[PDB]
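Lecture 7, part B: from sequences to assemblies.

Below are the input chains for today's worked example.
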Amino acid sequence: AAAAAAAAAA
Amino acid sequence: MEINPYLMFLNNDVTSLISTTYPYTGPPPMSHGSSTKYTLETIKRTYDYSRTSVEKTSKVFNIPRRKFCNCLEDKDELVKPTGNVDISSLLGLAEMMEKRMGEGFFKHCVMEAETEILKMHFSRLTEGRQTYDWTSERNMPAATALQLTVDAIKETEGPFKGTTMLEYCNKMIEMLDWKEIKFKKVKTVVRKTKVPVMGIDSIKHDEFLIRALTINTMAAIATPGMIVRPFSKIVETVAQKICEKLKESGLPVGGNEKKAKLKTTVTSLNARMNSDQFAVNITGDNSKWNECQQPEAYLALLAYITKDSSDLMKDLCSVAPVLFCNKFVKLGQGIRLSNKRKTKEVIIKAEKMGKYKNLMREEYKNLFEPLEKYIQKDVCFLPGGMLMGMFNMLSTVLGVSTLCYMDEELKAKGCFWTGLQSSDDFVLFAVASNWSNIHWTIRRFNAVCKLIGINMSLEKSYGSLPELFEFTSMFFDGEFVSNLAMELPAFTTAGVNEGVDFTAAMSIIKTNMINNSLSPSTALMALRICLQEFRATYRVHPWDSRVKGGRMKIINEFIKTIENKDGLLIADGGKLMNNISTLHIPEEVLKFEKMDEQYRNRVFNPKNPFEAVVSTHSFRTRANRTLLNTDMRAMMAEEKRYQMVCDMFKSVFESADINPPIGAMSIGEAIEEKLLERAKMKRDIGAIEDSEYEEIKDIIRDAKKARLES
Amino acid sequence: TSPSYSPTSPSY
Amino acid sequence: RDESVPLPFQTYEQMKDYCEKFKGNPRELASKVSQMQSNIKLPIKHYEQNKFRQIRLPKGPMAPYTHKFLMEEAWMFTKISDPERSRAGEILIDFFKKGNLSAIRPKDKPLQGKYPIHYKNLWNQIKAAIADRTMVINENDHSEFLGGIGRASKKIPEISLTQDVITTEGLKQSENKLPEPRSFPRWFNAEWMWAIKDSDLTGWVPMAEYPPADNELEDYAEHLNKTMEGVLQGTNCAREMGKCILTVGALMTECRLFPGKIKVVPIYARSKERKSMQEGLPVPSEMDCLFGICVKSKSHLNKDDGMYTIITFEFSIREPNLEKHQKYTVFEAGHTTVRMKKGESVIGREVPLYLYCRTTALSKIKNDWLSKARRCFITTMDTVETICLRESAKAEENLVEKTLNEKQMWIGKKNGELIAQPLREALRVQLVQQFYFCIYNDSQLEGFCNEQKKILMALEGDKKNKSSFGFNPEGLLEKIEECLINNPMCLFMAQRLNELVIEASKRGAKFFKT
Amino acid sequence: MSLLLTIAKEYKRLCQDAKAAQMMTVGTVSNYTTFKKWTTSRKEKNPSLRMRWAMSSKFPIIANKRMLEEAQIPKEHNNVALWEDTEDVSKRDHVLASASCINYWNFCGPCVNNSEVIKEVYKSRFGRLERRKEIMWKELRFTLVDRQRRRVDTQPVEQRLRTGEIKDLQMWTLFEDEAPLASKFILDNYGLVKEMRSKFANKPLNKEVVAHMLEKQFNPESRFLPVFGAIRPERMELIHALGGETWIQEANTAGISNVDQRKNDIRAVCRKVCLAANASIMNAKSKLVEYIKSTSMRIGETERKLEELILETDDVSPEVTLCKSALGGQLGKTLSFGPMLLKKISGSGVKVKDTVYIQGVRAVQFEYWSEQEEFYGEYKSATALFSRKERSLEWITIGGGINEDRKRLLAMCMIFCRDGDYFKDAPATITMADLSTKLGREIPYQYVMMNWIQKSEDNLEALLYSRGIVETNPGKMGSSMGIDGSKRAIKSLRAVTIQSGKIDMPESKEKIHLEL
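Predicted structure of the full complex, as structure tokens:
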């Protein structure tokens, strides 16, 4: 689905 | 869709992209488990490939010896490898080979060998691969093994004063008649803590002979013993002198030179052609090349070469083969027993196989039972096989002897074959008037090859019109074999110290760029890769790099002082100043002019406590604690005793390491008189006390007492 | 008594 | 010496006499023709054997996933890196845990798991360790898992064993085992096509600075390296290269750091994001992302070769496939949030997260050669660069830039039609091929290629119509068959070689099509 | 002062051990060369990987102690431990320490004024950099045929010398205390001894290092290398940046060391000396040796005798072979005929005498060779490969660059070939070329017609036409050789074909010498 990095600690 | 990389081979020629079929980017394969299977299988392949039923009981060993040469059991499979050599036709190939080049070929080459060997100190025998030390019955680096051999001779019969290869050989042959030999062997004594106390062991001529002919397996390649090695080096130097003079020989000459040899012989053959004649080539590769060759035929051939040379060195030539004509081969680690429970396992020694007998699987039994004839307690005796890697020179001498003869046999229309050979590998060019005749020519040359025991691999070999063929990963066309796959693993850091590592890597990129013919951007990316792996290996990074660490924390305060931060050395945190044009120039030189004066002065001082540039960065690496824990150290107690001696003499004589010490004197005598001369030097003019010089003299004479008492 | 092959032309 | 002589003569003196006095007659012509009559076989004709029976391929279960890590289905966790915080790289996961990573827990009932409860307990030990320190303290847990669930087998000496031969107990026997052959993989093609396309993150591979330049060469070299690096850094193949280098390097340090100890090593790769929309922005994002967590067992080094054992846990957004994942034990881990921002609405909701687990063996040699994956670039570079020179050197002009874009390389097949791509994008195919060569290298693979060069040389022999021949092609194809067992890359390149033979035979026929 | 005392006491301790005492007493001192070979044979299996494992540890490195305590603080700045009193692993007087301390002393260390001492030690390397400073640059691309194998001096330096004599220089400049008194080199070549010993003897730093670097300073590395046709040894140092199969670079030949022309000057010297021996044919053996040992050459920075230059020079010219033949220097693997150089790769046969007719109705004996023999020809800007059988050329191929030089190759090699047409052309040969005027000496005939061809322009055309001429068939268009040396292939010579490329040169490591 061309969507790799994801999750951010923020 | 379906991605197929091989589709790019359609339009393009294969020889240019051939470096992408070889997967040299990854790790190699390697050995697991017991090597006894391969060893027994290979011995049975040796007795099998030698086709003879003639078996004569040896007088000395009370063991059947199968001597197969100039006799044939023919099997309905001829195409399958043969080990049987017909010595008459062999010496025929030797005669035609000599009469092709000079009448004095063998006499002269043997003269050169005799020269180089008679000069030779036996200490250079330590140079080479690992060899089998029979004292501890283990494989060792050649130097330590030779130290144990000579040391054992010293503790048995007294010290060895020979200092020559010839006298070493004389002592080797003298020990075979020795009824008793003494060893340095570490025996564990339970004092319950087991301290491996060094000890002195005894052995009998019967056991010592077998230990002397014993060869060891390496998970396979064989590593012969220390008593067999000098004579093997003799024959190998003879065959090297023979190889050098041969145009068709590819063994003694290699790298960039092999290339031009092939080019020259190619254009020579193309010019030699007639208008009727037809040229075609084949890439030959040989399987079981070592198992087919036999030391008996090598004994006959060596006797033929040494016929006219000298009767003094001829007896020294014939001794090398006969130790491989009766030779013992260590079996291996052995077999293991298990249940279906996977709980209990029973290890077996190679000695005790014949105890368990049928307990092994039927394959093991079928391979094992015939070898019980030639079996000994720990070891298996075979005459005819040639262990791999030892004689390679003489092997290619044989091959070139097969290729050398064209004028011989029949002057049939279009009878031509010649080519190159290195050990098993050979490239054959065949020329015949008509195409139908070519098959006949090729088959005749394979017939003589298999006649003396050179077996072309019918599976591996292939041939075509002259343009295409391969030699030792060198593929030919109008172009020449552009591949970096050979030299890949050497590009990484050399691992001695920092300056030597990087500068040596640079010069490696240079030499590869000239010879292996890689392109410049390839060498630039190689420079950057070697630089990154260098920085990671030595844990350094540039000053402008955000990376923080132990060595970088110093660089944080280092940066502000130095004006020119590019001229800094890489190991001190400097950025790369070298490039393709500067590859010949070490980084210290290229950065030196732009260095800050404080920097360059502080870094290069020779007093530091810590093509190659020494700088300040060179250091020595500590050995790990492995060999010191086992009894290998209890053996090393001798080597350390050599240590403090050599270090002492190097402290007395500064040029000892550079210029080898000479003159007729004892080490101790020269040390004493030299110490007296330096004492007189410092006393007469320079500053030292007179009573102190007499104290030094007192220490010298008191040392002469304890030196005399021994 | 071993046959031969003459490659008529090429293949591409 | 006197009993070592080959001839019917016994005394060495007689062999010596026959040697020194030897003069050969021309009787080896009849000896060679009788040897020729005895050797009846091996005349060879290409057109006769030109079929080569295509290529034989093994049949059985589909080949599994042999790579130590998951590529296509692997999932990432993005963290913007601090220079002093990430400089350790061990603390990277400790700063990761302050995020959402700590909450994820698998359920007790896995999908397609071999040893669920063990892996679940170990996962909890990793999460509990990361809080305090990254070493796992369990002395009983690792003893069963190590050796690849290899058990330490008690050894009974031979001296006391003789009675147990006289009285047979414990059911004493001896046997060895062989690997079970597999069949051609399907998924491999999709893996290649995924590694070929550019990932959203810019580059995964640390590459040093460029040296100073002089007009003549270093302009050409520096430019070519800038372009090739720029292309290959964005690919997912570079991603797997980077994670391999960084994590296998981490393990390599952990083997010296804590021998005989259990440690939690992250599986991670560093990447900086790059944005081509505008020049002026706040910053290009510099960060590092996490594929999963890893566990190391005893590092003790035997006199013979020791092989360390390793337990890999990877995140994935993807449903597992039992066929290629048979070695993997999958769980249902949780749900992960994924969103995008576009011209459309693109909300993205959430997608379930699966946790893949397995155990593998790493030799120290494999740790090294896999630790440096950068070598692949070079072997691609050369192969590419030569093509640009050999062309341009014909026209005595600078064709490098023109050859890269214009020259067409056959890449794949779609809809039964042969497809080609320019040399710049087909460069990714070579880089992926070399990287698989690094990852998938087995003894089987080396036998395959080293016996395959003969096939290729015969093919190009028929290419220029040189009427090439190999002597026992049944034997050659038996050696090629012999080296194809379980290796996915080996069987893949085998089948692709079949298709090459087919299309080449269609172009012109020196070969066969079934 | 105690530095000698503790050595004496150490000797006392060593000879008190009988095992070491007897091995110290028995035999020559040469046993040291063997004794050293008995240690540290163990090397690690992994070149880089082992070193990575080594630098992984924080305190792997073995380093000296005394100097650091003398100069600098052992403790750190950031409170990461540096030094201990414990000697671990191998037991030697060095105490282990961390890697970063080296960097610290490279930073804050108290050292001054080492600059001038460094460079003239490494002047080999520093000079190899100095030469790269002055050159200019241009870039292009071509399909380039390099000359595949030339054995050619690389990294050339003035006053280059053999390995033994440079070992003598090593011993004399390093230390006087233990040195042999070595006559041959020191007496004749003194004044390089003065320079080297003067600069290196006063400041005792890195004795072993300076030695082993001076060994390489005077040693040109002659390897088997591809060259694209610039044969000056200065370009050989950096070929890679310059040329290759696809490479090209320019603006080079200008900057070179003074050796390259000095060698040619020595060639002219040997020319004049051999002429001096040619003037008087009473004896040529006793006079030329006098002319050799008497002459003294002045090299730019040093005075050196002509004997030690001739015997030990690398480049073998047709003259230099003659000058060496008077001495005992063995340099083989070289064939010299006129301006041309040759090497013999194949066959053998005996010299035979055949009397054949000239056009002046007179008979003169000609010594010819019957062999099937394949030799490589070498001429200015042209290389080729020839094979003669039974006094006539069998196979020929020309790899030459320039047309005229190709024609010269063809000619000269025809002279060495000596066909029957060699006799048919005799336009006024007898009046002059027959009898050379030197004390009434008849000059050999091969060189007679060689000189007749060197005479004028039409004499080349004569024997060039003496070979069979035929219109060449298609497929030989590129290989065919015109009378004037071109490839147009309308009319071409028989038994010759040009190759597009160069031709590789053979090499053999051999030494042969006999009296003249």
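Note for the exam: DSSP finds 24 helices and 20 strands in chain B. Keep this in mind when comparing with the next example.
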